[PDB]
C-alpha positions as YAML, in Angstrom:
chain: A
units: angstrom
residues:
- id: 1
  name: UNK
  ca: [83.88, 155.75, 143.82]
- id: 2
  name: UNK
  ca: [86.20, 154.70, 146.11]
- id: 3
  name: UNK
  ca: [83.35, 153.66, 148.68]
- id: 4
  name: UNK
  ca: [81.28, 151.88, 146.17]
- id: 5
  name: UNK
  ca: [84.16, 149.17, 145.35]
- id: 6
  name: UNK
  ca: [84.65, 148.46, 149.49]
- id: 7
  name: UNK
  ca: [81.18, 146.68, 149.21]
- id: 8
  name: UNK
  ca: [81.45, 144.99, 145.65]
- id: 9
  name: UNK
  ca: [84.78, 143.02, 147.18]
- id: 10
  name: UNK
  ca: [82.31, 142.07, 149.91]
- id: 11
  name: UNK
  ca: [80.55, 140.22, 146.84]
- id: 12
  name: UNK
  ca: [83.23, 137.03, 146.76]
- id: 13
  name: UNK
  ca: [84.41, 137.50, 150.12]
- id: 14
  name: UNK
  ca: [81.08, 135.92, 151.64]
- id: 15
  name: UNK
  ca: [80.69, 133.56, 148.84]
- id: 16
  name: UNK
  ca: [84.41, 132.23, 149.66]
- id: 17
  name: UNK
  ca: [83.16, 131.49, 153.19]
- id: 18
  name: UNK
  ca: [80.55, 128.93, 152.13]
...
């Protein structure tokens, strides 16, 4: 769903910050 993906981009998004 199109509201399950919005969180699993979250996934390397914090990683990239630290």
């Amino acid at each position: 769903d199109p509201r399950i993906a919005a969180r699993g981009r979250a996934r390397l998004r914090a990683v990239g910050a630290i």
